[PDB]
Amino acid sequence: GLIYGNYLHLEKVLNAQELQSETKGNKIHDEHLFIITHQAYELWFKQILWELDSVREIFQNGHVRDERNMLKVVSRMHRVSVILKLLVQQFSILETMTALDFNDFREYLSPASGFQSLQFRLLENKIGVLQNMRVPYHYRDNFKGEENELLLKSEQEKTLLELVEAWLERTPGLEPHGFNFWGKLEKNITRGLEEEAEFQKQKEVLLSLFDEKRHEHLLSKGERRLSYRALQGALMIYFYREEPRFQVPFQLLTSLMDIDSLMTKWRYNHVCMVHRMLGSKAGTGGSSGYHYLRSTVSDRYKVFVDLFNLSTYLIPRHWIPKMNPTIHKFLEH
Amino acid sequence: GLIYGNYLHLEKVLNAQELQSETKGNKIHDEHLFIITHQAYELWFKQILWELDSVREIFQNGHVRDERNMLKVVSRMHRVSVILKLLVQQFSILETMTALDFNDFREYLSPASGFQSLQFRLLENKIGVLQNMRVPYNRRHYRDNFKGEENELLLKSEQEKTLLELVEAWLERTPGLEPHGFNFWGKLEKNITRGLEEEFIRIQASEEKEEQVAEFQKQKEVLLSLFDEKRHEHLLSKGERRLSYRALQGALMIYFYREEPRFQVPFQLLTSLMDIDSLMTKWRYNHVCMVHRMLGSSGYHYLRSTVSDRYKVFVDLFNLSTYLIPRHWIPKMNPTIHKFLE
Amino acid sequence: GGLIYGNYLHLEKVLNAQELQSETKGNKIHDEHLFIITHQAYELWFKQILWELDSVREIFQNGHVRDERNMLKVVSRMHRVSVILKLLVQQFSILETMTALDFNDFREYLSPASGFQSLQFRLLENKIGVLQNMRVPYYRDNFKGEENELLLKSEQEKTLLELVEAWLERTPGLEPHGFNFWGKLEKNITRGLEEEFIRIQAKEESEEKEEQVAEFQKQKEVLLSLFDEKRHEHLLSKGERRLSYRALQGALMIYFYREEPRFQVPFQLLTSLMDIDSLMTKWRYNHVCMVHRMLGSKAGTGGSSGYHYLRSTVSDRYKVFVDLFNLSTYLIPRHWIPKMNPTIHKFL
Amino acid sequence: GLIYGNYLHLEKVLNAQELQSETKGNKIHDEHLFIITHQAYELWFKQILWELDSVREIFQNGHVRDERNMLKVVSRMHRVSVILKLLVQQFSILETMTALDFNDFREYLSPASGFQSLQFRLLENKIGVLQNMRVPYNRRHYRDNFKGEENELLLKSEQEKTLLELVEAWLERTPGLEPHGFNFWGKLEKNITRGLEEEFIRIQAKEESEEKEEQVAEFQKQKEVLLSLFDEKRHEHLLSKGERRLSYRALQGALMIYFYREEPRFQVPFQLLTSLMDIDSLMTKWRYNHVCMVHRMLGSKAGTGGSSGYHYLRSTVSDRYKVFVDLFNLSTYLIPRHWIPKMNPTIHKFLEH
């Protein structure tokens, strides 16, 4: 007969708490909280990696092409968002520890830090954080052996951003000899602008959308991440989100943005707590601490920044290329 | 140098995930969520027992008598309420699993259940849920589901002093109860008798009138029953009250005089104890709401049944709200008893 | 000149709506201000919920729901209602920063006013589909005038339950000369059970053989009772079920075939309706836990026993979509679900 | 007899929703959500100001001197943090509005902006945000969206004693600072000087390794920082640069309360200092949650109020807006427990109730 404790391998989970304070003969009560909090964070990182890798594989094995798999994809990405939302709230627990009580066992941690969280790095990589865009103080130095391996894989293997890019490139309606969404959009913006103080600034920005080369330049830097075609596909799904075939894809784009918002919210709630815990003192990891973590709360680490930025290029309803009754029929189930 | 992974024993924590569906050649994706969810609850149960045991020990070793330890007692009990709040919110994650997807792996779990969580039972016992008062499941004692060391650890948890018992003892020594001192109880009965008489005269001064006489007689009946020590002892034996009559007086002394400096942090403690009771019951209810959607309408009925005042250990602290009186009826503190508390 | 923030939001009304009765009667009590603001915030959100719910009711009433382009709008708004209800459950945390002792200093100035007099809460219960007969003995005589008028309209106009029921009855696949979901489901469950019993009978007499017989007979009784329409009609009339027999079949079709593109957002909608029932009952339970600390076993200013009556509202008697939850009772092995064939795959 | 709707003036609260989209004959459904969300924020701002003004008044009228009132002070400041926590979560509601749908009624709002929220500025000012704390754009434009009585309230919110000023005054009176008494600051400098000397000796005694010279330069970093605590001229210099806000003596009060938090008379005061930090953290989380949403709603597009939008709001997510920034930065100056000046039986009894 299967038993709860055996099923859950609690013989491992609940025998994994060793206070260094106690091991060096000066047991500090709050060190137990510090350990349990990190462990719970790490269990949830594992669940997020389990969800994220199953979704990467659904794109990578071509299953995403079968639209009956979209409910699964959006449920699993929504589940990632719900977990991250709990991980943002979970800082509330560690904030019941005073800086003063933390200061009593802090010495016994050196030089260990969150910089040595394999799962946190795997998570960043698998979503599509680029190493060349990371702020310094580098990242992978902390790791060695069978772990530095897994990290290299996570960097080399296809990211969620790349798989979503590939899928967005294949979006119905972009075909120049098909619905020709882009051609019609350039025309409608160009006309609508002419049919008009302020108009000169928005004229500039809107028509910038149609500059492949500029996009390629901003891309070459890393101020954009998606191919120019992927961006068209995304904008197609935004404007035609009510068309049956675009409903759940739109939900997916929304959830990809949610995961960026919640990852940055996690970075900021971490920062707000570390300020109270250390002030201006440096982290046991070696970094300036507070000031480095503040730098990670930027669009540098927003993988799906393109999806946020498309809100720049929103236009009146009237201008969106009307859906030809035959194209309507292609976008029905 | 100490390394993150080794410090946290992640070689144990992150190698503790075995899908029974995969072990039996039919891996079901959502079983991984089911496993991590329970493991996270159990880590947090372990943290709660760590705080709860530290606080029990502070009461038991007589350290709580030194009022410098009150900040630490109330910080740890508040921290238990903050963890319990997260554990209530944590059901949101397992609710992303459909009943249909749960149905694809639940056969591989049988006959294991949350009924076998050692830590959940330790937590219930250490707060002070009485064996006497538990709803029986399948006509049997909760402790049957446990054998060997786990069974003994649970006996110890039932027999050792509970949070309820240690708070009770501390409440009994609340300053001000001394008959030959401030004599809170004697003075309180006198002021309540006067308050009621003055109230009766204001009313005895219409349809609005005959209602207030019935209501007045209700509030009269209730307030005066507070001084009936035999009614109280009787409700004790029937487990409908949990604290001794004297502990109850101590709690009411803290409620009424909470702004007195020596009673400020003690009042926060009594608030945190009600907080833990309320959050344990919200845990039991959110569990129920989820199980309903997973299994349909029996387990679901025993669970709905744990969502009751039988499992509210500090039910007496809530029910004191029954006996609140106008501020101006509360016995005045003279400059000699103020001094003791200031 | 330009629209100003304060004028746009009519803050001249919103922030001039706070009158402490304690102060009006010459004994200002600080925490009364919190009591007022908390209730006003709840009522703004009730008005928002009614705005979303009325809009979704209309999309069903006018047949716009028949155009499946409108399903993202329907699910987004129903989801939005559950996000708001989540905040309103959390919002009790604010009023619990008020001690029972401080509440006791201004409580007297409230009576005989009570939450029973919340028009919007009653409008919300009625519009979702809380039935008059299945309300706890100890509602509408607390009201009069247009208010009493608006409540009657809310009792007679088509509820979300009735509108979802009608829509579930048109679910594709139920057609006896089409996919014939119900015929094939009965056939597959009957066959699946017959085979499960041969599997059990074939075993040599044992302890776990008899437990399996006992378990088989319970499973068989539950699953076959799904196909007993007279039972369903009997349970409708006792208020134990709410959805028509055919709407139940449509719901189970959406459950089983939820991954089929035409069923993906309908499944999200059914999930949302269960979310709203769960959050409404959580609202009632968080309300009960607070009122217990505030009043104990004292009677409410509105007449009721208080804590005891409020506890009675926390039952499946108030779950409008009970039937959506209880379809979990009738889940079956994946292999028993009638197969979709390249013609019915394409229709969906 | 009193009736619910009348008690709460719902004839005002629920007759305050006017969609501009509908007024200009193009009703947009999601505009209702936009209005109700702002109105709920403005009710809770009003409640926060009610709690805040009541705690300011307890300091200003001297009632805070009587330690009976400390439970009430901490309960109401904790209440403010519980409200702010709901207000941070409340953004999740308005995030169920897509940028696409927002774009359909946005045009009808211009040039109105949250920038024009009287109550938000009253809240900033009464906590104690100073003109020089505010980012150039904020400082320039914020006062000049207001006239008449609204202008007068803004001025009052700046002229009258802020929570920062009233807490500073109270911290200056913290028992144990008096040189003739416990002489906290003198004893602390002596124990830290002695403690650093013992540490230098421990480090110098180690065998001339690489790790040792890492301890040496790390010690010399920690020594400069700790001993800089006792340089009052440096404090006044960081005050001028607005990197610190509290008086040197208020800072000594705060650190006294921190180290001796378990002494009965410092238990609730320590809870107050924690609550003031919580309020600063939740105010900045409110600003950051606002930013994350405004990014999805506008992208790089400028706001209706006149600002760059995303980039201006992002610039308010800064410690220059943290009023009690000094209470956080005291963590820089934590020392081993054994260096904290020992409590004598006489001052112990002084810090009992």
Ligand code: HEM
């Ligand atoms: C009192 C609590 C905490 C303090 C004082 C703290 C402090 C720090 C500091 C100073 C850093 C910068 C690296 C360094 O110099 O060592 C850091 C990074 C990090 N911390 Fe924490 N931390 C705390 C809690 C947590 C928790 C609960 C987690 C959960 C896993 C966590 C995860 C991380 C991660 C992943 C990094 C690397 C982040 C990045 O590079 O972007 N920390 N922490």
Ligand code: HEM
């Ligand atoms: C799909 C999710 C879940 C289902 C269907 C479920 C079902 C049940 C059922 C039916 C029982 C009654 C005993 C029995 O029939 O064996 C039970 C009890 C219990 N479950 Fe769960 N459960 C779930 C998730 C959880 C989680 C996440 C926890 C976290 C620790 C948990 C903890 C418990 C505990 C402690 C009990 C004993 C409760 C008591 O006696 O008051 N369950 N569960």
Ligand code: HEM
């Ligand atoms: C100190 C806080 C509160 C207390 C003591 C309290 C007390 C009560 C009581 C005793 C009743 C039952 C009717 C009666 O006997 O008067 C009731 C019903 C109600 N209350 Fe509250 N209440 C509180 C807060 C709230 C809040 C914040 C709301 C928000 C809208 C609310 C909404 C209602 C509603 C709608 C009802 C009718 C519920 C039903 O019949 O199902 N209450 N309350």
Ligand code: HEM
């Ligand atoms: C779609 C939702 C929202 C958008 C697009 C938005 C946009 C903006 C923008 C662009 C600004 C900068 C001033 C300007 O250029 O106009 C601003 C400031 C502000 N918003 Fe919002 N906002 C939104 C929701 C809210 C809500 C719900 C509140 C609630 C009270 C609010 C309160 C404020 C306040 C107080 C300011 C001034 C902040 C400061 O000066 O630091 N906003 N908002």
Ligand SMILES: O=C1C[C@@H](c2c[nH]c3ccc(F)cc23)C(=O)N1
């Ligand atoms: O000031 C510090 C402490 C340290 C830290 C944070 N989380 C941890 C978890 C495990 C561990 F061993 C060390 C840490 C860090 O990052 N800087």
Ligand SMILES: O=C1C[C@@H](c2c[nH]c3ccc(F)cc23)C(=O)N1
């Ligand atoms: O239908 C069920 C499943 C089982 C259960 C709940 N939580 C668990 C955790 C681990 C485990 F192995 C089994 C369970 C239970 O009580 N009723």
Ligand SMILES: O=C1C[C@@H](c2c[nH]c3ccc(F)cc23)C(=O)N1
């Ligand atoms: O004991 C009580 C208090 C009263 C109450 C609850 N919420 C209210 C809101 C407005 C009002 F005027 C009165 C109330 C109620 O229902 N029973």
Ligand SMILES: O=C1C[C@@H](c2c[nH]c3ccc(F)cc23)C(=O)N1
């Ligand atoms: O694009 C926008 C919208 C506008 C805004 C935000 N909150 C408001 C509240 C009332 C109002 F009238 C306008 C607004 C702003 O600041 N930029």
Ligand SMILES: C[C@](N)(Cc1c[nH]c2ccccc12)C(=O)O
């Ligand atoms: C057949 C297809 N699933 C079509 C496709 C691609 N990208 C999309 C985005 C939204 C909607 C549909 C699509 C495929 O090529 O994957």
Ligand SMILES: C[C@](N)(Cc1c[nH]c2ccccc12)C(=O)O
């Ligand atoms: C000396 C004492 N600490 C007094 C005591 C007991 N219970 C209390 C409740 C509130 C305030 C004080 C007390 C003790 O006997 O523990």
Ligand SMILES: C[C@](N)(Cc1c[nH]c2ccccc12)C(=O)O
């Ligand atoms: C044409 C149709 N929209 C079909 C329909 C009805 N109910 C459903 C449930 C799920 C999916 C589709 C339907 C209608 O009649 O409304």
Ligand SMILES: C[C@](N)(Cc1c[nH]c2ccccc12)C(=O)O
């Ligand atoms: C008499 C006194 N309440 C003393 C005082 C001032 N600041 C403090 C901080 C913590 C504890 C006490 C104080 C007063 O002067 O206000």
